[PDB]
Amino acid sequence: VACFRMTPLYNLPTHRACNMFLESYKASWILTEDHSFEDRMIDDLSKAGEQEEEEEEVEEKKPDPLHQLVLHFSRTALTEKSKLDEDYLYMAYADIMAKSCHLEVEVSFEEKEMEKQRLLYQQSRLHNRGAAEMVLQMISACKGETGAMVSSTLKLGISILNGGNAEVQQKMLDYLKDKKEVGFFQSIQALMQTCSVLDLNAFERQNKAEGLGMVNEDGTVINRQNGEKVMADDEFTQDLFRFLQLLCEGHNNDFQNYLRTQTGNTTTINIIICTVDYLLRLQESISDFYWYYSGKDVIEEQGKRNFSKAMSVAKQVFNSLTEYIQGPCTGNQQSLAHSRLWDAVVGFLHVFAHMMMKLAQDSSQIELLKEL
Amino acid sequence: CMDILELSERLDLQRFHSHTLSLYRSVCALGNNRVAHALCSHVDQAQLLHALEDARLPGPLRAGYYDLLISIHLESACRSRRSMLSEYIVPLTPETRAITLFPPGRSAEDGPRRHGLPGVGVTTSLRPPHHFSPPCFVVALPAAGATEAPARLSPAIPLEALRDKALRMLGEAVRDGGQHARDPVGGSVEFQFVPVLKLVSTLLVMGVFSDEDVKQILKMIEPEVFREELEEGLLQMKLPESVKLQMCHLLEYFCDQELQHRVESLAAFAECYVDKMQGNQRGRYGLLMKAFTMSAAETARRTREFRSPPQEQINMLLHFKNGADEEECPLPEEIRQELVNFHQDLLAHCGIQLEHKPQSLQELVSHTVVRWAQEDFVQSPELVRAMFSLLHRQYDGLGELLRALPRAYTISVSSVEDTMSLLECLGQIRSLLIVQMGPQEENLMIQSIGNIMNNKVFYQHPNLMRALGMHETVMEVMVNVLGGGESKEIRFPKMVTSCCRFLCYFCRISRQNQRSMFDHLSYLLENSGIGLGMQGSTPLDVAAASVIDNNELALALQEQDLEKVVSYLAGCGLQSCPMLLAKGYPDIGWNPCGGERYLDFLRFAVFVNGESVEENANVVVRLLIRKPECFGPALRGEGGSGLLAAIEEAIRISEDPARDGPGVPPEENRVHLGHAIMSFYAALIDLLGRCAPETHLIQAGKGEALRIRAILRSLVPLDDLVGIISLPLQIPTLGKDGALVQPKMSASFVPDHKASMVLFLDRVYGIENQDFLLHVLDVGFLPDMRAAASLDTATFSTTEMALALNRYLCLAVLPLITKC
Amino acid sequence: RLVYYEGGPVCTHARSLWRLEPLRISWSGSHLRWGQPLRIRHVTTGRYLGLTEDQGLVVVDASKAHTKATSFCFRISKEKLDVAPKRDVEGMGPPEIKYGESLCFVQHVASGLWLTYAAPDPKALRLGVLKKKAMLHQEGHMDDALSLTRCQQEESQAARMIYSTAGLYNQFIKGLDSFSGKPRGSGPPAGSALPIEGVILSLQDLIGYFEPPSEELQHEEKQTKLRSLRNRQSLFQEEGMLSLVLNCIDRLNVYTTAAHFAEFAGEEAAESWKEIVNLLYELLASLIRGNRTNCALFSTNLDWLVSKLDRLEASSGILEVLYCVLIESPEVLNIIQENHIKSIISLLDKHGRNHKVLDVLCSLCVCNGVAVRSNQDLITENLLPGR
Amino acid sequence: GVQVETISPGDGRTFPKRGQTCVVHYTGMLEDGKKFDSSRDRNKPFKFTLGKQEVIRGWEEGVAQMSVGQRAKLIISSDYAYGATGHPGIIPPHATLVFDVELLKLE
């Protein structure tokens, strides 16, 4: 019927064809075009001028343009306000700064060393100009609300902390212990609580929506093309826990203890226990998914993708806990021992034991078995 | 009197008069054109121009008079034009066809390396004109009633002379700054420059400057970069930070003009390219049809393209950026090459494709911003933000175009007039976002909404409406009005009803419109806590329209929104209506009207296209049982009388005045409590029946479906349904010497109440036993069928009760008997 | 007098602050230990948690707060271990109870009852209130344990200041009411003496306390100071000091001039009438300045403020209060009326060309980038055409 | 409404007729001498058509009485002026108006 009916492109009004062409050209030619300007922009902004012209006697020199930009965003974050307004300029410049730190046959030892030194220099460009303090201030100012602003802040923090940057870790810890503000960890705890897990109801709704076949043509309207409803914020969850891991990377004992107990603050939040709580939630969700798929002989593609996303988040959380406790941090070890980690481990052991057998019995799920 | 120039030494008078000018600006601020006309009598055009040109004026008074001129004569037009300037509705005319990225030349292959002068040349984006009225104070005052006359226009001032004076004043200021005199106009460089630059920027944004004027302004900004074919420009003059802020505003305008030129060039190219693609596809289809089935598989392969939707055809025909063969992309190479060349031109224009002098606007802006930041530690946060926004645009011109394109739209020449009218109406609505709602504003908003809904472009270009963001603007205005002083009552119910009706129509127009409004469901549900004061369309109605009969959106519905609605329903079931209590109604202890509204929304949420959505129905049933007060006092466990007893008590209430109304008819004969109670219980039974599972699920034996049906049967006994279906209805009769004695439908038991009972009986209990079928026929259905048949006389055929009975029968009863 | 478990914004207010007072005086600041008897004092009211036979668990006055009624202790568990003896020591002692981490059961020492929450209030949903009356019970519940949370030095200082200031201003109001309607004629004022010196010093101290931060300050520390000032304004308002200041202003406003005041309070008292009224208006302005929540309170009694604009003793202070209110609150702008606008214009007419009145009118016209057409039209109609 | 007092004489022969466009230059003052309007400030003569009710009644009658090239003073009572309502923000309620009107030409 519909297939028999012809819908040629040439039997269209010119203006409608123009709008369709603009959409398609934007999607396929402009969006796909790759232009790398972040490094050039950051280099231009970091370069100062005429230091020889003013020869400021005081060692304290005026900030250079990149420093002034970072200071402006720090001022915005420090302004007393009820909420942090979405700021496209801040998001764009945070993305530019994050991309400036690239983190790029077997590679030679000299090549690897040069790559490490280059990344260190790129991160120093930012954290010598207050980027670490700006990241902390923006996280505190987000006040536990998820969104593009906190996503950009977390990505920038990860970029400047990648490789366990000891100098950035020291700067962040010094700033936190000097300011003695509970807002930072309150915001972190709220974000962790808002992080989502696998939802079987959302999965069933998505399955029914995908199964439903609309009547009109695909081009005219959406055609059941909607964003994922199951663990839609998995990227943000991974970014948050990666940031927390990078704070402790390298067996940074001071930050490991600080994440558990903020001595100077009026109130403390146990980020280790918060992480354990999220892990328990995720484990229960994964157990529910396994029980849903236990009867079925084979796991479909969408179920496989959801399992993979949940397992990636769980892997990041486990790595974060390992980073918390390694060194060892005896305080963190005791906290975890008394926490609810054991129940999560028991549930994970049950899920692993049964999923290994189920996935081994079939060969189309080899990649999923390897990930598990 | 004294010379106003004595205020340079009389400082108290100077301060008082400057604050007086501030007060003038405040009273005419944000679109009060009537007050602007009034102020034209207190500060006339001659005074304003003389003050503009006066060099001895103290700085505060100079700035005050410049700002007063802008506020009285230019602020409203500038604001409306600025609101319009972020969108690109490009008509497909010869002028648009003639637009090219680079001016005709030979400097480089990807168009001449040199751009055209920004803001100079042909531009075709639609922008409604400026409207001004003469400032006359001897005309007869409108004899029309208050608030019915058309909105006042801004006072008129001669724009040609004003722009010439502004240009001359800017040139003189540049010369004086070069000279470095010891007595700057206004007492300081800032006072000399900032007012003039503000006036110039305002005029630029209004777009009253001609091409020659724009060329002069560009030369003043930078003589060398903007040379066509003072020796020092403004950008190298060592100016204060506020002057730099005004310079940033000018540069922002010119960058916006460059972006607009890029968008229009893209649209002009798109017209020709889609024309060529359509011609080529027509030729290819002709050739394929002429081919006499060389191969059936090949024929199907080729014809799949024409079977595909036009958007997918366009995507396939354009998918050759990285190279493709004639099989993948049938587009010929000579046509592919045009797109490749244009893409190269666009990248070159954006600078993405690659001296100590800038030589271009982008380079000039980048160099200037970086030089300012290097030279000084800038102290003004507004200045810092402006400079870095400009720098970001310069470095990411391509991203700028990408973000601008969603707001571009091409239209045929035939739609230009209607689009202009729609743009004027939308400009009025947008202007209403910055003013507290009053009677005149409400009238203007209603008129604008009516004009928009009458406009045909509103229906033919829903994508254009969504891009313009009309729905968001209307929703924001409505929510502002609702939130403002919501505690006492809802003011401007006519305005709220108009906005809600417009939004419902917007949802009905298109499925993408429905999804766009569905994205704001939580907002609408948040603001729908207070209702029933409008007596018409409400944000709850908008929310229902945003999901009605859309399976995708119904499945996308959120449990949180469902709980919010259920909590509203519980509150209605526990508390009485404050509006009714104020009007004097008896306090019955709950709110059947609001309860019914929330039940209606839930019904639309759970039932879609004649079938129950299990995911929504199970959630709704669980929420309702978790908050039993939602069922009303009758279905209350502890002391509930039961459904049948509740309906009978409601009938008694309706019969008895002083239990049904205030008893101390402006709208639909006020509200009647007995009918309200009956309607609430009918709506609840209807919602539960629609929540009942489907027969195919029941046969499949799903445990969840069987459990839900068991819960529904537990809630509603069958005997209560049969009793309500058996309750007698009032029938029109002839009496009092041929007078027609008719029941009041809005205050009595009606067949619509039995229809819900029939629906619940059919969907939850069903009829499968002949004895039960005969019993229900004998007690409930046959008497109503007989009444409907008896009302088929010439006197009673068209009565309200007769028509309601016909609807009830044909929609509930007869289909059930046919099934059984 | 009653005690509740409440979970709203009260967790940041001053009425939820308590002070733990061990029965000893020396080393009373030592570490708190399990089973150690102590009193629990409510900071803002100065009353002690206690058990009364007639009413049960209440807060009683210090006069009635004897040891048997008001002695409580913290217990790790509900077991019957009180048999274990406890002996005081000279020094900080062993640390036993931790902020946040430790869970404490509160037990009335004399009776052995446990501090718990009363049974759920009937028709709780119809109330719409989650407040739960607290009580002393023999058994209690499993979730009776409490967590002790520290409060900031600024918060505790503000609570104590609220207690003292409320006492002083209530005493002042009572003194004024003592002779409200009794003219002295020629003789003693015929009332109770007024704490004039204390009131003046307290008002000056509170004005200094609420002084806004200076503009020359750096952005970060200015923001911190602004946050602290907003918090302290909110604390005082929530404890009701704004209403107390308004009551004092009303009682003093009843009199038209210092001589009229002296006719009832005596010459010595009347010597400070103008100073006290000016200080009260200054304190009110300091309390509401920059605080939208405090400024919005005047949307209900705007007439109370506007009707006082013509008083000649504190014209500048009253105008400053009005300016703060109009700058902050759009609700006041929405409820403004033509008579109010005419009163402000009359201020212009009768007090001279003061640019602050023009500023007030501008603030009436526009607030937060939203225009009030009714106010604009009223000002235009009532101010311009006269010329 | 209106009283007309000549300031400078016109031609004395040509007078506006119904449906004719009068071009004038005017300055308006309140009865106490406060100026509130003037076309000379805008530098553009004011044009209006007789009999279309575009202007107040006092103007409609006074300009009709005037003659081409004539300068006159029109004293207009409140009822012929904006009257009780007035012109909010410009003319107070119940205001007598004084105008200095010159009839430049007829077209």
Side-chain angles (χ1 to χ4, degrees), chain B residues 644-664:
Chain B
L644 180 51
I647 297 304
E648 283 162 341
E649 181 68 1
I651 283 157
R652 277 173 253 142
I653 286 164
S654 85
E655 284 161 353
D656 180 45
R659 283 222 287 148
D660 163 44
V664 184

Side-chain angles (χ1 to χ4, degrees), chain A residues 60-91:
Chain A
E60 172 260 292
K61 254 150 183 233
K62 63 158 107 85
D64 63 90
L66 184 55
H67 202 345
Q68 288 180 56
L69 173 79
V70 172
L71 287 169
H72 178 252
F73 287 136
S74 289
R75 153 165 188 136
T76 304
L78 282 167
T79 287
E80 194 224 346
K81 264 179 97 289
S82 61
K83 78 182 318 282
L84 186 65
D85 299 295
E86 189 138 318
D87 181 17
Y88 88 100
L89 193 66
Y90 167 75
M91 270 146 37

Side-chain angles (χ1 to χ4, degrees), chain B residues 158-179:
Chain B
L159 278 180
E160 176 139 322
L162 185 59
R163 88 163 92 109
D164 294 356
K165 181 193 302 287
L167 278 202
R168 177 202 330 141
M169 263 155 25
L170 185 56
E172 284 164 2
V174 168
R175 270 201 308 71
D176 297 355
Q179 272 321 63

Side-chain angles (χ1 to χ4, degrees), chain A residues 92-228:
Chain A
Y93 269 111
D95 289 16
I96 288 153
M97 289 192 253
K99 269 186 209 37
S100 52
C101 307
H102 298 314
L103 184 90
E104 289 300 292
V105 154
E106 182 51 59
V107 180
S108 147
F109 174 92
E110 316 328 347
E111 276 313 281
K112 280 180 32 63
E113 214 45 40
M114 215 31 48
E115 272 329 272
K116 274 195 232 316
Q117 292 310 120
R118 194 173 352 277
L119 175 71
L120 279 175
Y121 166 78
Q122 293 167 339
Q123 294 171 330
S124 88
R125 266 197 313 206
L126 296 185
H127 77 63
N128 280 323
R129 283 160 181 97
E133 287 90 18
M134 182 199 73
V135 160
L136 296 185
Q137 292 152 357
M138 275 286 180
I139 284 162
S140 178
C142 86
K143 271 158 198 323
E145 303 300 312
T146 42
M149 298 278 303
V150 73
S151 304
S152 288
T153 315
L154 281 182
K155 275 160 189 318
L156 177 53
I158 289 159
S159 302
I160 64 181
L161 272 166
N162 259 326
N165 197 315
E167 221 173 332
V168 177
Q169 280 168 1
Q170 190 56 246
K171 276 162 191 229
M172 298 190 151
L173 193 52
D174 285 350
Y175 180 77
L176 288 174
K177 287 178 147 155
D178 186 52
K179 263 46 199 182
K180 278 181 220 65
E181 74 293 53
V182 301
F184 175 75
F185 285 112
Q186 266 155 29
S187 189
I188 292 276
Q189 168 184 57
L191 295 163
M192 204 166 330
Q193 274 159 356
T194 63
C195 280
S196 75
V197 300
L198 281 181
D199 190 30
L200 263 176
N201 290 331
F203 184 54
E204 312 240 36
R205 293 169 170 269
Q206 196 191 60
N207 284 341
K208 197 100 65 154
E210 261 144 48
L212 257 54
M214 80 180 252
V215 190
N216 225 28
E217 326 204 68
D218 191 330
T220 62
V221 305
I222 190 46
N223 236 24
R224 323 292 163 155
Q225 257 72 74
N226 39 270
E228 305 313 70

Side-chain angles (χ1 to χ4, degrees), chain C residues 20-21 32-40 71-77 82 86 96-97 103-109 114-115 145-148:
Chain C
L20 303 182
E21 319 207 326
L32 217 70
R33 305 145 47 51
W34 302 107
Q36 174 181 2
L38 48 92
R39 286 180 176 112
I40 300 155
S71 205
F72 293 83
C73 65
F74 290 117
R75 308 269 330 273
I76 195 137
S77 66
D82 315 88
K86 164 143 212 313
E96 265 167 58
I97 311 188
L103 278 186
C104 310
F105 294 95
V106 187
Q107 189 187 35
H108 192 254
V109 179
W114 297 99
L115 177 75
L146 298 184
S147 170
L148 302 193

Side-chain angles (χ1 to χ4, degrees), chain B residues 616-758:
Chain B
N616 283 352
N618 301 339
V619 169
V620 160
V621 163
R622 278 189 288 264
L623 293 175
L624 286 189
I625 66 183
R626 286 290 87 105
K627 284 195 221 252
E629 52 259 37
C630 300
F631 296 135
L635 265 43
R636 169 176 323 299
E638 308 287 339
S641 55
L643 196 77
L644 180 51
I647 297 304
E648 283 162 341
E649 181 68 1
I651 283 157
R652 277 173 253 142
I653 286 164
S654 85
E655 284 161 353
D656 180 45
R659 283 222 287 148
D660 163 44
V664 184
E667 37 72 12
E668 324 87 16
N669 254 288
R670 40 187 199 65
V671 154
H672 301 271
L673 288 187
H675 180 82
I677 294 151
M678 295 168 220
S679 295
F680 173 90
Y681 283 119
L684 176 81
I685 295 320
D686 183 80
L687 166 69
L688 295 182
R690 295 198 199 276
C691 278
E694 292 286 321
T695 56
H696 77 273
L697 292 195
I698 294 291
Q699 312 312 18
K702 268 187 51 45
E704 192 111 326
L706 288 153
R707 179 185 321 136
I708 292 297
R709 210 187 43 175
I711 289 163
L712 296 172
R713 290 169 174 206
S714 307
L715 291 172
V716 193
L718 181 58
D719 316 72
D720 276 44
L721 293 156
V722 176
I724 286 144
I725 283 154
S726 307
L727 279 175
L729 290 159
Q730 221 191 137
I731 295 318
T733 38
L734 252 194
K736 297 181 73 67
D737 311 284
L740 221 53
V741 172
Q742 279 177 88
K744 211 176 150 35
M745 307 304 288
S746 77
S748 64
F749 188 54
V750 294
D752 230 338
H753 297 158
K754 296 162 135 198
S756 310
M757 301 328 152
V758 173

